[PDB]
Amino acid sequence: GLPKLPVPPLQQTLATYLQCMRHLVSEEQFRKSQAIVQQFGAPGGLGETLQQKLLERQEKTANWVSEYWLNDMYLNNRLALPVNSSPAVIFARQHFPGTDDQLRFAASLISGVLSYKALLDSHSIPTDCAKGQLSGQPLCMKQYYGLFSSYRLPGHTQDTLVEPEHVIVACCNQFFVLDVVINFRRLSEGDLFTQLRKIVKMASNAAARLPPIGLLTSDGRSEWAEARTVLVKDSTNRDSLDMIERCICLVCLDAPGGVELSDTHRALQLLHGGGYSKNGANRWYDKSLQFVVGRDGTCGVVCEHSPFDGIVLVQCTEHLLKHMTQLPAPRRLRWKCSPEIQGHLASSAEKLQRIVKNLDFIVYKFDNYGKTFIKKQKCSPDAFIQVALQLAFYRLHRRLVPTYESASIRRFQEGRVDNIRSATPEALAFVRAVTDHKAAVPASEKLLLLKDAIRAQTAYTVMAITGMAIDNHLLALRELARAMCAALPEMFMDETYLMSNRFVLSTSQVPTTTEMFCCYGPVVPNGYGACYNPQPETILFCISSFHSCAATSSSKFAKAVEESLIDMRDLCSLL
Numbered sequence: 001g002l003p004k005l006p007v008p009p010l011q012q013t014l015a016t017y018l019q020c021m022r023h024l025v026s027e028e029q030f031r032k033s034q035a036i037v038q039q040f041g042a043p044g045g046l047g048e049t050l051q052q053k054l055l056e057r058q059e060k061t062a063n064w065v066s067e068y069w070l071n072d073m074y075l076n077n078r079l080a081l082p083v084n085s086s087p088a089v090i091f092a093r094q095h096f097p098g099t100d101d102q103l104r105f106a107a108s109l110i111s112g113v114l115s116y117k118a119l120l121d122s123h124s125i126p127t128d129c130a131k132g133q134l135s136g137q138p139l140c141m142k143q144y145y146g147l148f149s150s151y152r153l154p155g156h157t158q159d160t161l162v163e164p165e166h167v168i169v170a171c172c173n174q175f176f177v178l179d180v181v182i183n184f185r186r187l188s189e190g191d192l193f194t195q196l197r198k199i200v201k202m203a204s205n206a207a208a209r210l211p212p213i214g215l216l217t218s219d220g221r222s223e224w225a226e227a228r229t230v231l232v233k234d235s236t237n238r239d240s241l242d243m244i245e246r247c248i249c250l251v252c253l254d255a256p257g258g259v260e261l262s263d264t265h266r267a268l269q270l271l272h273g274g275g276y277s278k279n280g281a282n283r284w285y286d287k288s289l290q291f292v293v294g295r296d297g298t299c300g301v302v303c304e305h306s307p308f309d310g311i312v313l314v315q316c317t318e319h320l321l322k323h324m325t326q327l328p329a330p331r332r333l334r335w336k337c338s339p340e341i342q343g344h345l346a347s348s349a350e351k352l353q354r355i356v357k358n359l360d361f362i363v364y365k366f367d368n369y370g371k372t373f374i375k376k377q378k379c380s381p382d383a384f385i386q387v388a389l390q391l392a393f394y395r396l397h398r399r400l401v402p403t404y405e406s407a408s409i410r411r412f413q414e415g416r417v418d419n420i421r422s423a424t425p426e427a428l429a430f431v432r433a434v435t436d437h438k439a440a441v442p443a444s445e446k447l448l449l450l451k452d453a454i455r456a457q458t459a460y461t462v463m464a465i466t467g468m469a470i471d472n473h474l475l476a477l478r479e480l481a482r483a484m485c486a487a488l489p490e491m492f493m494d495e496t497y498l499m500s501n502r503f504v505l506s507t508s509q510v511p512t513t514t515e516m517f518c519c520y521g522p523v524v525p526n527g528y529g530a531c532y533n534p535q536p537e538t539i540l541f542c543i544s545s546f547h548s549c550a551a552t553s554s555s556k557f558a559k560a561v562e563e564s565l566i567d568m569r570d571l572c573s574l575l
């Protein structure tokens with residue numbers, strides 16, 4: 001009973017687009033972009049033709065952007081999924097004195113998964129109602145049904161999102177089939193614990209060890225598509241891939257790390273496993289959910305997020321963790337490795353280690369204040385924090401950049417997200433006043449600039465979540481144009497448009513109720529990834545960047561965030 005994603009008016013989107021980019025390009029580049037957009041948007045022109053094709057599309061589809069967005073955000077992306085794509089959720093520290101304590105946790109977690117899947121298959125789950133901005137409104141539930149049912153196949157140029165029930169268990173880079181529902185008749189926690197004891201014993205036998213095929217899923221998508229094409233030439237490889245493809249989830253029983261179990265190092269283990277020499281091959285990145293249960297108590301889940309976004313994921317995992325309860329041998333999946341496959345594995349190992357060494361990651365806990373203080377200033381906490389991130393970026397790098405912030409459009413049928421473009425002209429005015437000390441702008445006027453930047457950020461936020469923002473609209477017009485002619489219209493070849501979609505700062509808010517946190521890598525080589533968790537009295541930031549970029553630094557950016565939050569508290573405390 002949810003409404004269809006709206007199609008905003010064309011002239012609205014084009015005027016918002018120009019206002020979004022004017023302050024981020026030169027005078028001359030903008031003048032050219034203005035002329036291009038005017039011709040695109042002229043009466044009887046190409047824009048209007050495309051808009052009419054888009055309204056026809058809205059009438060005939062449940063959601064007119066779903067296919068375009070899924071390809072542009074995920075399936076067309078050629079980069080390896082670790083760090084570049086798959087986010088990580090880190091649970092609370094656990095203490096596993098013995099192996100059976102780790103395996104009791106795993107058994108308890110798996111049966112929590114089985115019972116959660118039974119609720120979904122009940123189709124009796126009450127509709128989620130929004131929290132925060134525009135509270136109380138009903139939200140789409142489709143994403144819950146992609147948590148367990150999905151596998152992402154690699155393609156040469158574009159990926160594809162695709163019996164008795166079983167889990168796959170990864171241990172010592174070996175994969176084991178663990179059947180769990182054996183005719184609508186679930187195995188108990190006790191049975192699962194017993195089955196996991198057998199897997200650990202068998203995975204420990206070095207005479208029986210098979211090559212670490214999971215490492216192949218860590219490569220570039222076109223490279224893994226090619227390697228997979230080799231594998232499927234043999235029958236027993238095909239059967240093994242089939243079991244992984246139809247599994248409920250992965251459960252990875254990781255070896256202990258060597259390092260201090262800081263929040264930052266626990267996150268690193270969930271994001272890439274520390275590479276081939278630690279837990280990096282104890283993975284299968286094509287599958288949507290990989291639950292990690294490390295021997296040292298490091299536990300979380302790695303997500304192939306093409307079928308769902310973070311809010312739905314965390315509601316599931318918080319459900320699982322809260323409800324957790326305090327016979328043939330599982331089959332080991334077999335493989336036949338060509339001489340060629342041996343070479344694919346060597347390159348996968350080398351490419352994966354470059355990712356491991358390239359990632360610069362920090363978990364930073366701002367503890368001077370949280371949402372409560374911000375609400376007392378009559379501000380949205382998310383908008384407050386977004387403005388602070390723009391100040392952080394500007395005081396460090398002395399420029400503002402196209403920024404991405406996730407906004408859920410789950411108020412509409414099959415809605416996923418649109419983009420809140422936080423790098424507004426009001427943000428620019430504020431951060432310049434704060435950092436340009438020659439200008440000597442009085443603190444009272446800085447406060448007025450702070451309040452107007454928050455106002456603009458909230459206004460864009462409301463627009464985005466009601467389906468009236470620009471990114472999805474423009475994407476659809478672009479891909480509708482592409483279908484009529486491979487030569488795209490000038491508006492989408494314009495350097496201004498290409499720049500507008502290089503998100504040097506890529507952000508999202510994922511609040512949790514518990515001690516878990518979320519993190520992901522940047523989406524451009526010279527950029528940051530920034531996932532935050534605002535609580536009443538604290539704000540948790542997970543900051544990523546790439547060591548190969550000499551300008552970026554996760555530690556420096558985190559100190560800039562702290563400085564920006566203190567500056568903004570001092571400004572709000574004036575009046």
Ligand SMILES: C[n+]1ccc(C[C@@H](SCCNC(=O)CCNC(=O)[C@H](O)C(C)(C)COP(=O)(O)OP(=O)(O)OC[C@H]2O[C@@H](n3cnc4c(N)ncnc43)[C@H](O)[C@@H]2OP(=O)(O)O)c2cccc3ccccc23)cc1
Binds near residue numbers: 407509523
């Ligand atoms: C490029 N790429 C794409 C994707 C990814 C992976 C991501 S996938 C995206 C996951 N993220 C989302 O999907 C975010 C969805 N969120 C929304 O869309 C929100 O709507 C948003 C953020 C727009 C606004 O945030 P808000 O909280 O709604 O608004 P607020 O902050 O203003 O309200 C708070 C409190 O303040 C009150 N209030 C408001 N105004 C006030 C005022 N003026 N005065 C006083 N009070 C005021 C409110 O009433 C409330 O009150 P309270 O409830 O506390 O009592 C991901 C991350 C992590 C893990 C993943 C795992 C799996 C899959 C994906 C994962 C990475 C990179």
Ligand code: NA
Binds near residue numbers: 418419472
């Ligand atoms: Na978008």
Ligand code: NA
Binds near residue numbers: 549551552554
């Ligand atoms: Na860097």
